[PDB]
Protein backbone atom coordinates (compact mmCIF):
# COMPACT_ATOMS: atom_id res chain seq x y z
CA UNK A 1 0.00 0.00 0.00
CA UNK A 2 3.05 2.28 0.47
CA UNK A 3 4.11 1.85 -3.17
CA UNK A 4 4.55 4.53 -5.80
CA UNK A 5 1.97 3.40 -8.31
CA UNK A 6 2.14 4.45 -11.99
CA UNK A 7 -1.46 5.73 -11.92
CA UNK A 8 -0.38 8.76 -9.84
CA UNK A 9 0.96 10.69 -12.84
CA UNK A 10 0.09 14.32 -12.20
CA UNK A 11 -2.05 13.76 -9.11
CA UNK A 12 0.39 12.65 -6.42
CA UNK A 13 3.99 13.73 -6.13
CA UNK A 14 6.73 11.09 -6.48
CA UNK A 15 9.35 12.67 -4.25
CA UNK A 16 7.37 14.68 -1.69
CA UNK A 17 6.80 11.93 0.89
CA UNK A 18 8.39 11.56 4.36
CA UNK A 19 10.94 8.92 5.33
CA UNK A 20 10.37 6.39 8.08
CA UNK A 21 6.93 5.45 9.39
CA UNK A 22 4.53 7.69 7.31
CA UNK A 23 6.39 6.73 4.12
CA UNK A 24 4.05 6.04 1.23
CA UNK A 25 0.96 6.73 3.35
CA UNK A 26 1.31 10.48 3.84
CA UNK A 27 1.89 11.99 0.40
CA UNK A 28 1.26 15.22 -1.44
CA UNK A 29 -0.60 16.42 -4.50
CA UNK A 30 1.03 17.78 -7.59
CA UNK A 31 0.93 21.54 -7.74
CA UNK A 32 -1.50 21.53 -10.68
CA UNK A 33 -3.78 18.83 -9.26
CA UNK A 34 -6.89 20.78 -8.34
CA UNK A 35 -9.83 19.09 -6.62
CA UNK A 36 -13.45 19.38 -7.74
CA UNK A 37 -15.57 21.16 -5.17
CA UNK A 38 -19.02 21.63 -6.74
CA UNK A 39 -21.46 19.43 -8.64
CA UNK A 40 -20.86 19.87 -12.35
CA UNK A 41 -23.48 20.36 -15.05
CA UNK A 42 -25.06 16.96 -15.69
CA UNK A 43 -28.71 17.40 -16.68
CA UNK A 44 -28.06 17.94 -20.41
CA UNK A 45 -25.64 15.03 -20.91
CA UNK A 46 -28.33 12.25 -21.12
CA UNK A 47 -30.12 14.40 -23.70
CA UNK A 48 -27.05 14.47 -25.97
CA UNK A 49 -26.08 10.85 -25.43
CA UNK A 50 -29.39 9.64 -26.84
CA UNK A 51 -28.53 11.64 -29.98
CA UNK A 52 -25.24 9.72 -30.26
CA UNK A 53 -26.71 6.22 -30.37
CA UNK A 54 -27.33 5.22 -26.77
CA UNK A 55 -30.54 3.26 -26.33
CA UNK A 56 -32.45 4.31 -23.19
CA UNK A 57 -32.26 2.07 -20.14
CA UNK A 58 -36.03 1.55 -19.97
CA UNK A 59 -36.43 -0.71 -23.00
CA UNK A 60 -32.92 -1.96 -23.74
CA UNK A 61 -32.67 -5.67 -22.63
CA UNK A 62 -28.90 -6.00 -22.35
CA UNK A 63 -26.28 -6.72 -19.70
CA UNK A 64 -22.72 -7.91 -19.25
CA UNK A 65 -19.44 -7.18 -21.02
CA UNK A 66 -20.94 -8.02 -24.43
CA UNK A 67 -22.18 -4.42 -24.38
CA UNK A 68 -20.75 -1.39 -22.61
CA UNK A 69 -22.83 0.47 -20.04
CA UNK A 70 -23.20 4.25 -20.11
CA UNK A 71 -23.21 5.66 -16.57
CA UNK A 72 -23.32 9.31 -15.51
CA UNK A 73 -22.38 9.80 -11.82
CA UNK A 74 -23.47 6.27 -10.94
CA UNK A 75 -26.79 5.75 -12.75
CA UNK A 76 -27.34 3.82 -15.97
CA UNK A 77 -28.17 6.09 -18.87
CA UNK A 78 -28.23 3.25 -21.37
CA UNK A 79 -26.46 0.57 -23.36
CA UNK A 80 -24.30 0.91 -26.48
CA UNK A 81 -21.89 -1.35 -28.35
CA UNK A 82 -18.15 -1.38 -27.68
CA UNK A 83 -17.65 -0.17 -31.25
CA UNK A 84 -19.95 2.85 -30.95
CA UNK A 85 -19.13 3.38 -27.25
CA UNK A 86 -15.64 4.56 -28.19
CA UNK A 87 -17.06 6.67 -31.03
CA UNK A 88 -19.50 8.36 -28.65
CA UNK A 89 -16.70 8.74 -26.10
CA UNK A 90 -14.38 10.64 -28.43
CA UNK A 91 -16.99 13.23 -29.37
CA UNK A 92 -17.70 13.80 -25.68
CA UNK A 93 -14.03 14.72 -25.33
CA UNK A 94 -13.99 16.71 -28.56
CA UNK A 95 -17.10 18.68 -27.59
CA UNK A 96 -16.07 19.35 -24.00
CA UNK A 97 -12.75 20.85 -25.11
CA UNK A 98 -14.21 22.81 -28.01
CA UNK A 99 -16.68 24.45 -25.66
CA UNK A 100 -19.48 25.20 -28.13
CA UNK A 101 -21.78 22.51 -26.70
CA UNK A 102 -24.12 23.92 -24.01
CA UNK A 103 -24.34 20.65 -22.07
CA UNK A 104 -20.81 19.31 -21.68
CA UNK A 105 -18.67 21.00 -19.02
CA UNK A 106 -14.90 21.19 -19.18
CA UNK A 107 -14.67 19.52 -15.75
CA UNK A 108 -16.34 16.27 -16.86
CA UNK A 109 -14.53 12.94 -16.49
CA UNK A 110 -15.43 10.55 -19.32
CA UNK A 111 -13.82 7.29 -18.30
CA UNK A 112 -14.06 4.80 -21.14
CA UNK A 113 -12.94 1.25 -20.33
CA UNK A 114 -12.32 -0.70 -23.57
CA UNK A 115 -13.23 -4.39 -23.90
CA UNK A 116 -10.29 -6.66 -23.21
CA UNK A 117 -9.52 -10.27 -22.38
CA UNK A 118 -9.89 -10.62 -18.57
CA UNK A 119 -9.13 -6.94 -18.00
CA UNK A 120 -11.16 -4.38 -16.12
CA UNK A 121 -14.94 -4.53 -16.47
CA UNK A 122 -15.88 -2.48 -19.56
CA UNK A 123 -18.25 0.44 -19.87
CA UNK A 124 -18.41 4.20 -20.21
CA UNK A 125 -18.40 5.73 -16.73
CA UNK A 126 -19.02 9.48 -16.80
CA UNK A 127 -18.11 11.29 -13.58
CA UNK A 128 -19.01 14.85 -12.65
CA UNK A 129 -19.46 14.88 -8.89
CA UNK A 130 -17.68 16.55 -6.01
CA UNK A 131 -14.28 15.78 -4.53
CA UNK A 132 -12.60 14.47 -7.69
CA UNK A 133 -8.94 14.75 -8.66
CA UNK A 134 -8.23 16.80 -11.77
CA UNK A 135 -5.14 17.79 -13.73
CA UNK A 136 -4.70 19.93 -16.85
CA UNK A 137 -3.43 18.44 -20.09
CA UNK A 138 -3.27 19.80 -23.62
CA UNK A 139 -5.50 18.16 -26.22
CA UNK A 140 -3.79 17.87 -29.62
CA UNK A 141 -6.66 18.35 -32.10
CA UNK A 142 -7.63 22.03 -31.61
CA UNK A 143 -4.98 22.73 -28.93
CA UNK A 144 -6.77 23.72 -25.72
CA UNK A 145 -6.75 22.87 -22.03
CA UNK A 146 -8.37 19.55 -21.17
CA UNK A 147 -9.05 18.50 -17.58
CA UNK A 148 -8.72 14.79 -16.79
CA UNK A 149 -9.15 12.51 -13.79
CA UNK A 150 -7.19 9.41 -12.75
CA UNK A 151 -9.92 6.91 -13.67
CA UNK A 152 -9.92 8.56 -17.11
CA UNK A 153 -6.13 8.71 -17.44
CA UNK A 154 -5.17 5.03 -17.24
CA UNK A 155 -6.51 4.16 -20.71
CA UNK A 156 -5.49 7.22 -22.71
CA UNK A 157 -2.10 8.26 -24.06
CA UNK A 158 -0.57 11.60 -23.14
CA UNK A 159 2.91 12.72 -24.12
CA UNK A 160 5.33 14.33 -21.73
CA UNK A 161 6.59 16.87 -24.32
CA UNK A 162 5.49 17.73 -27.89
CA UNK A 163 8.83 16.50 -29.28
CA UNK A 164 7.74 12.99 -28.25
CA UNK A 165 4.28 12.93 -29.85
CA UNK A 166 3.87 9.75 -31.87
CA UNK A 167 1.27 9.67 -34.60
CA UNK A 168 -2.16 8.00 -34.22
CA UNK A 169 -1.35 6.89 -30.66
CA UNK A 170 -0.95 10.12 -28.64
CA UNK A 171 -4.12 12.08 -27.94
CA UNK A 172 -2.79 14.56 -25.37
CA UNK A 173 0.45 16.25 -24.33
CA UNK A 174 1.33 17.94 -21.07
CA UNK A 175 1.69 21.70 -20.77
CA UNK A 176 4.99 21.17 -18.93
CA UNK A 177 6.74 18.11 -17.46
CA UNK A 178 6.91 19.81 -14.03
CA UNK A 179 3.19 19.94 -13.21
CA UNK A 180 3.54 16.41 -11.81
CA UNK A 181 5.78 17.59 -8.94
CA UNK A 182 4.51 19.34 -5.82
CA UNK A 183 5.34 22.82 -4.45
CA UNK A 184 8.42 21.70 -2.50
CA UNK A 185 9.49 19.37 -5.32
CA UNK A 186 9.79 21.97 -8.08
CA UNK A 187 11.84 24.18 -5.79
CA UNK A 188 14.82 21.86 -5.47
CA UNK A 189 17.14 22.83 -8.32
CA UNK A 190 18.35 20.41 -11.02
CA UNK A 191 16.33 17.62 -9.40
CA UNK A 192 16.69 15.46 -12.53
CA UNK A 193 20.39 15.06 -11.61
CA UNK A 194 20.18 14.01 -7.96
CA UNK A 195 19.60 10.48 -6.79
CA UNK A 196 15.96 9.98 -5.80
CA UNK A 197 16.53 9.30 -2.05
CA UNK A 198 18.26 12.71 -2.05
CA UNK A 199 15.33 14.50 -3.66
CA UNK A 200 12.94 13.04 -1.09
CA UNK A 201 15.09 14.17 1.84
CA UNK A 202 15.00 17.77 0.63
CA UNK A 203 11.22 17.74 0.71
CA UNK A 204 11.77 16.56 4.29
CA UNK A 205 14.56 19.04 5.08
CA UNK A 206 13.15 22.00 3.20
CA UNK A 207 10.32 22.16 5.72
CA UNK A 208 12.53 21.73 8.79
CA UNK A 209 14.41 24.99 8.22
CA UNK A 210 14.84 28.03 10.38
CA UNK A 211 13.42 30.32 7.72
CA UNK A 212 11.01 33.23 7.94
CA UNK A 213 7.52 32.12 9.07
CA UNK A 214 5.82 35.40 8.32
CA UNK A 215 6.28 39.14 8.73
CA UNK A 216 3.39 39.85 11.11
CA UNK A 217 5.16 38.28 14.10
CA UNK A 218 4.14 41.13 16.42
CA UNK A 219 0.46 40.13 16.26
CA UNK A 220 1.31 36.42 16.56
CA UNK A 221 1.41 34.66 19.92
CA UNK A 222 2.70 31.26 18.85
CA UNK A 223 4.42 29.15 21.50
CA UNK A 224 7.59 28.52 19.48
CA UNK A 225 8.66 30.32 16.33
CA UNK A 226 11.95 30.21 14.41
CA UNK A 227 12.93 33.30 12.40
CA UNK A 228 16.13 33.59 10.37
CA UNK A 229 17.46 37.11 10.31
CA UNK A 230 18.89 37.90 6.85
CA UNK A 231 17.40 35.68 4.18
CA UNK A 232 18.37 35.87 0.53
CA UNK A 233 16.69 34.98 -2.71
CA UNK A 234 18.56 32.20 -4.53
CA UNK A 235 20.75 32.66 -7.56
CA UNK A 236 19.75 29.22 -8.81
CA UNK A 237 15.97 29.09 -8.50
CA UNK A 238 13.13 27.38 -10.27
CA UNK A 239 10.61 29.44 -12.18
CA UNK A 240 7.85 28.46 -9.75
CA UNK A 241 9.86 30.18 -7.01
CA UNK A 242 8.90 33.61 -8.36
CA UNK A 243 5.37 32.43 -9.10
CA UNK A 244 4.30 31.38 -5.59
CA UNK A 245 5.77 34.44 -3.93
CA UNK A 246 8.52 32.58 -2.11
CA UNK A 247 10.55 35.81 -2.13
CA UNK A 248 8.16 36.89 0.62
CA UNK A 249 9.54 33.97 2.68
CA UNK A 250 13.32 33.60 2.30
CA UNK A 251 14.51 30.33 3.83
CA UNK A 252 18.24 30.68 3.42
CA UNK A 253 21.36 32.28 2.06
CA UNK A 254 23.83 31.99 -0.80
CA UNK A 255 27.07 30.72 0.70
CA UNK A 256 30.37 30.49 -1.19
CA UNK A 257 30.82 26.73 -0.84
CA UNK A 258 34.11 24.99 -1.56
CA UNK A 259 34.33 21.26 -2.27
CA UNK A 260 37.71 20.50 -0.68
CA UNK A 261 39.31 18.17 1.84
CA UNK A 262 41.41 20.70 3.72
CA UNK A 263 40.41 20.64 7.35
CA UNK A 264 40.29 17.06 8.57
CA UNK A 265 37.19 17.88 10.61
CA UNK A 266 34.54 17.49 7.94
CA UNK A 267 34.64 13.92 6.70
CA UNK A 268 31.55 11.77 7.32
CA UNK A 269 28.62 14.15 7.12
CA UNK A 270 29.91 17.13 9.12
CA UNK A 271 30.91 20.48 7.65
CA UNK A 272 32.67 23.63 8.84
CA UNK A 273 31.95 27.35 8.66
CA UNK A 274 34.33 30.27 8.26
CA UNK A 275 34.70 31.76 11.72
CA UNK A 276 34.56 35.35 10.48
CA UNK A 277 31.52 34.49 8.36
CA UNK A 278 29.18 34.29 11.35
CA UNK A 279 31.03 37.00 13.15
CA UNK A 280 29.34 39.01 10.36
CA UNK A 281 25.83 37.58 10.73
CA UNK A 282 25.92 34.42 8.59
CA UNK A 283 23.08 32.02 9.30
CA UNK A 284 21.95 33.99 12.35
CA UNK A 285 18.45 33.38 13.67
CA UNK A 286 16.27 33.88 16.73
Amino acid sequence: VRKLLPESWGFLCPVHTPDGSPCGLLNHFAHKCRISTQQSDVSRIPSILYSLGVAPASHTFAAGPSLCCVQIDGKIIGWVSHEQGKIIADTLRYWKVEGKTPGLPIDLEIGYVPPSTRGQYPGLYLFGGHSRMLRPVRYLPLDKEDIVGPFEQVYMNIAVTPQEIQNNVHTHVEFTPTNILSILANLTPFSDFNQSPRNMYQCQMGKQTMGTPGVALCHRSDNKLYRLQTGQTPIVKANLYDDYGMDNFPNGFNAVVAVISYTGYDMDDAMIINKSADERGFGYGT
Partner: protein
Protein backbone atom coordinates in the same frame (compact mmCIF):
# COMPACT_ATOMS: atom_id res chain seq x y z
CA UNK B 1 0.23 -26.53 -24.79
CA UNK B 2 -0.40 -22.81 -24.33
CA UNK B 3 2.88 -22.43 -26.23
CA UNK B 4 1.13 -24.25 -29.08
CA UNK B 5 5.13 18.87 -46.47
CA UNK B 6 3.73 21.47 -44.08
CA UNK B 7 2.51 24.41 -46.21
CA UNK B 8 3.87 27.34 -44.16
CA UNK B 9 7.51 26.51 -43.38
CA UNK B 10 8.03 23.22 -45.21
CA UNK B 11 8.88 20.17 -43.11
CA UNK B 12 7.90 16.52 -43.55
CA UNK B 13 7.96 16.00 -39.76
CA UNK B 14 4.55 17.18 -38.55
CA UNK B 15 2.23 15.37 -36.16
CA UNK B 16 -1.20 13.94 -36.96
CA UNK B 17 -3.89 11.96 -35.15
CA UNK B 18 -7.22 10.68 -36.46
CA UNK B 19 -10.52 10.28 -34.63
CA UNK B 20 -13.77 8.74 -35.83
CA UNK B 21 -15.99 11.37 -34.29
CA UNK B 22 -19.74 11.04 -34.64
CA UNK B 23 -20.47 7.63 -36.15
CA UNK B 24 -18.96 4.73 -38.05
CA UNK B 25 -20.86 5.93 -41.14
CA UNK B 26 -18.71 9.03 -41.65
CA UNK B 27 -14.98 9.25 -42.24
CA UNK B 28 -12.35 9.60 -39.56
CA UNK B 29 -11.28 13.22 -39.16
CA UNK B 30 -7.55 13.44 -39.85
CA UNK B 31 -6.23 16.26 -37.66
CA UNK B 32 -2.89 17.96 -38.28
CA UNK B 33 -0.93 20.05 -35.77
CA UNK B 34 2.53 21.47 -36.39
CA UNK B 35 5.74 21.76 -34.35
CA UNK B 36 8.14 23.53 -36.74
CA UNK B 37 6.01 26.59 -37.59
CA UNK B 38 2.66 26.01 -35.89
CA UNK B 39 -0.13 25.81 -38.48
CA UNK B 40 -2.97 23.42 -37.71
CA UNK B 41 -5.81 22.03 -39.84
CA UNK B 42 -7.96 18.93 -40.32
CA UNK B 43 -9.24 16.69 -43.11
CA UNK B 44 -12.44 14.64 -43.23
CA UNK B 45 -13.09 11.76 -45.68
Amino acid sequence: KSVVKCPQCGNEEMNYHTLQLRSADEGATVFYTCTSCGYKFRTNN
